[PDB]
């Protein structure tokens, strides 16, 4: 498996085409996406909820895309307020009815110049990080996922917590031979191994406090046990009874910041990768356990 | 042959799994067309097979191993059935030694060439006259337990995995594991509607929440001794964690950290006693089920998970 890389790059800056303001922008999100849900969990954190509209899709992905729930209804799926789309790709097909990649989330959308700002996740949560600073209160104004000191070791473990983690376990679902499953899910697990003493003593990844390497982390290692163990075959062992540490760094997150628990909808979860990938999972059933989705605080 | 071969199948329309019974149903008696002997029976198999691998773990606490030949189909279950290794080479598969078959198939076909239902594993073969006693696994066991008592050792001889007393509880026991945990697995498996998969996956874990219960401060289900019951347990929970936790989505929890009596049991018997540990052949478990139901695992991969396929004991 390769992953086609993200066509709309676009920074939100003071400037630029693109300026930071009150009731703007608005994110095209599913909740079972964890790339969209970098967004969702960064935006909550920076409390951007004011300059930044969400519409939450059906996370039932049949042939045309992600469905507004005015097709597929779905409980916490939105209709489309803006542009009144039926599926995702008539937000891309709008602005480039020429537009050649996949139609994927998360969309970050301008609502002024009626186009597509940025759709690369990693991207937005940086932008979402910094961009909106001067007009936030105090205590959301400092929160910085990104500070100068740690920007050289969050870039490092990015880099490959990308490669063999979070892109990882999807190379490990789609691949279509014994040979690039075993060659996919190997490295995954290894880095396991690597984040999971690199926590041994701490709270967080980089550097004692909460940064975007462990927003990027937490997305995957949240889908791990409910997901990825069965459905991508990600399953040398688990999360909660394979990696202690991991296992306490992402339930910390969870239960300690409605940030991380609130962008977090198990059913959308479960039922998008199970019902919609019919090339893994022909029959669209979604197993019950683990039961359950995610356990309590030690 | 395709339509009753190739394991890309047909379910209820409901969605749930309906077992076909086994049809050769025959017994070795002292006067029957089957009469125990010494070197005239031989046994079919897979070791991917839980019902299979019932006969082969009686076979070897029963000290039959001299008596019954087996031979070993390569668990690579493709369009024309389990296949023998000279058709499909895996290691620890066998060509057939005697009817020189290509699949499975072709001992039902060569007995009964208007067979209409599946070729299964186990079957118990009669060399004198080239046709089948009996393909139950059930009824396999049974009859190894006491068919031939007559002419093994006396340790041997006097072993009994289904004793008078203990019996109507074996029955008991027997049937509710057989319908809810032993078949349970494949109901909720082969299930292709999210209802039918929930209504045989609840019930499962039901029946392994009581089983559990049952084991508190037990080392054997009945009776404080090994019974058949026991064995016909031991061949689903085995395959469990390796298994059926993805392949069937019986994930509910697992054996190895859901489970503590069940572990604690199964741990027991496989590695103490060699009847259960040198039947139980896991490369061959995992390859089956994951390369040959191609109607639940499209690719065929083979998952690298769980490590290990059994723990050590504690
Ligand atoms: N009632 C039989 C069931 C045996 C059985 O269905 N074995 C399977 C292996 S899981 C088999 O040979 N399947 C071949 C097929 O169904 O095509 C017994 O207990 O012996």
Same mark, same amino acid.
């Given at each position: ?72 209804? !779905?409980?916490? #799926?939105?209709?489309?307020? *803006? ?6 790709? $008539? /937000? &891309? ?34 932008? !979402?990080?910094? #961009?909106?600073?001067?007009? *936030? ?6 929160? $910085? /996922? &990104? ?51 690199? /926590? ?52 910390? /997150? ?45």
């Amino acid at each position: 498996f390769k992953r086609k890389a993200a066509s709309f790059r676009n920074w939100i800056q003071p400037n630029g085409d693109f300026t930071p303001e009150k009731g703007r922008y608005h994110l095209y999100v599913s909740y079972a996406c964890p790339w969209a849900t970098r967004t969702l969990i960064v935006r909550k954190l920076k409390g951007l909820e004011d300059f930044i509209g969400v519409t939450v899709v059906s996370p039932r992905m049949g042939s045309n895309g992600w469905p507004f729930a005015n097709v597929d209804p !779905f409980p916490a #799926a939105d209709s489309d307020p *803006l542009n009144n789309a039926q599926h995702v790709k $008539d /937000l &891309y097909l709008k602005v480039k009815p020429d537009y050649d990649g996949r139609f994927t989330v998360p969309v970050l959308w301008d609502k002024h110049t009626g186009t597509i700002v940025n759709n690369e996740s990693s991207e937005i949560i940086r932008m !979402f990080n910094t #961009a909106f600073n001067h007009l *936030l209160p105090e205590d959301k104004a400092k929160l $910085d /996922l &990104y500070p100068e000191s740690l920007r050289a070791k969050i870039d490092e473990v990015n880099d490959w917590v990308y490669d063999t983690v979070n892109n990882g376990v999807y190379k490990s679902g789609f691949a279509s031979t014994q040979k690039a499953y075993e060659a996919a899910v190997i490295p995954l697990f290894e880095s396991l191994d690597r984040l999971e003493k690199m /926590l041994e003593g701490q709270d967080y990844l980089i550097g004692g406090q909460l940064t975007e390497a462990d927003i990027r982390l937490f997305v995957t290692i949240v889908r791990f046990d409910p997901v990825y163990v069965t459905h991508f075959k990600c399953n040398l062992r688990t999360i909660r009874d394979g990696y202690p540490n991991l296992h306490r760094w992402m339930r910390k /997150l969870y239960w300690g910041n409605p940030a991380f628990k609130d962008t977090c909808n198990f059913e959308h979860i479960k039922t998008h990768y199970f019902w919609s990938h019919t090339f893994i999972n022909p029959h669209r059933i979604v197993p019950i356990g683990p039961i359950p989705d995610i356990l309590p605080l030690d």
